[PDB]
Symmetry: C2
Subunit: 236 residues, 2 copies
């Protein structure tokens, strides 16, 4: 089994409610019977991999790969983490996610940009921030390995705190291609095994419709990996 | 052998001359006859450990642990690195430094904050920026292992580009303590083996005198490690 990304990212605010869902990770199969079992590392990490504190706040669903807040992060929580960050401003905190050192394919790092404020007002959010993470993701899919779900598009803290904003997604430029994003689906999956001899790189278009409708589009890149090698491929 | 820090940091600018010296790393001994031999990883890394490019610019002196620019980083160099950073703004780039996955005690990560400008005018620099890195370092020294040099204070790009600014350093609060920073020395060393049963943590004061004299002081923390365990200790 391997993650379809080496790194994930979202934002965390002061005083987000226990019960906020954060994002999903995804593991694809190396053999047909493989089933992921997700678990978190024990600690939260800050600047230059500083070990900050035991993670008392974030949990993952072992079967489905959903990360969520088990306990709210209040002002004091963020202070405990800040003071352990070796003098650097606390800008980012991350966790490790194992699927059965933290390195792809067996471990993903989930990064959260900390914002010292409340989650913003719903009405303040522009379509780009409602639709996709701040930097669009790219994906890793091994040739000649079984197809499966490798992404989910909806921003979970936005769907949770702003449930009155409707958001929908589709792909462009995937016709004839192995990718499925079905009507009303927030998931993206492959349809058949990939093969680097046919295509090494895909670049689809992800399209988000918010609401009066407004649309935002971003590239959707997928690199086809070797069945076996662990080394990251360059991305351009 | 082990590094006396897990992470190092400095700044890099556009168009710094080939031949700029950057900083030293230091490896202390686990047994009396051990001698480090330093080598760099093959690549430069950017945000969330993105593998950016082969490192064509920075070299290290294998015996002494001096990192320096073998080739200037011009506007185009920084563009090659930026475009490989997976859509994230290029703020930090790092290298791995092996002494015989990159994890203490055998591997240190050296981080450079990239500033898209020329190195600043010498006359613009305040004493704090002339004296110490932006976030002060802290050190790791194993109990019951041989003493040795574990830090060097002078900021090498500043000494190189601003040689008309005199800078000197000493410690306070080390009397009776195992630390030596000698008159006119820019190095700090231990004098005898440490022992966690006597002291687990030291917090000295590093004092820099610039030039008319102005002085800046910063804490100088040292954590005493187990002779054997690799796990980072929390720092407060």
């Amino acid at each position: 089994l391997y993650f379809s990304r080496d790194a994930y990212w979202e934002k965390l605010y002061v005083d987000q409610a226990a019960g906020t869902p954060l994002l999903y990770v995804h593991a694809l199969r190396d053999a047909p019977e493989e089933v992921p079992s997700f678990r978190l590392g024990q600690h939260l990490y800050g600047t230059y991999r500083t070990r900050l504190h035991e993670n008392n706040w974030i949990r993952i669903q072992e079967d489905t790969g959903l990360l969520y807040l088990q306990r709210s992060l209040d002002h004091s929580s963020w202070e405990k983490l800040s003071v352990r960050n070796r003098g650097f401003p606390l800008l980012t905190v991350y966790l490790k996610v194992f699927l059965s050192e933290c390195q792809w394919p067996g471990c993903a790092r989930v990064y959260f940009s900390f914002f010292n404020t409340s989650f913003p007002a719903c009405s303040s959010l522009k379509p780009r921030e409602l639709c996709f993470p701040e930097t669009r993701p790219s994906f890793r899919i091994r040739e000649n390995r079984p197809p499966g779900t490798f992404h989910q598009f909806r921003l979970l803290p936005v769907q949770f705190l702003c449930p009155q904003i409707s958001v929908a997604y589709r792909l462009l430029e995937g016709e004839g291609l192995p990718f499925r994003s079905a009507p009303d689906s927030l998931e993206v999956s492959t349809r058949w095994a990939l093969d680097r001899e046919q295509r090494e790189k895909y670049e689809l278009v992800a399209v988000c419709t918010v609401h009066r409708e407004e649309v935002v589009m971003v590239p959707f890149p997928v690199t086809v990996y070797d069945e076996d090698d662990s080394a990251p491929e360059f991305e351009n």
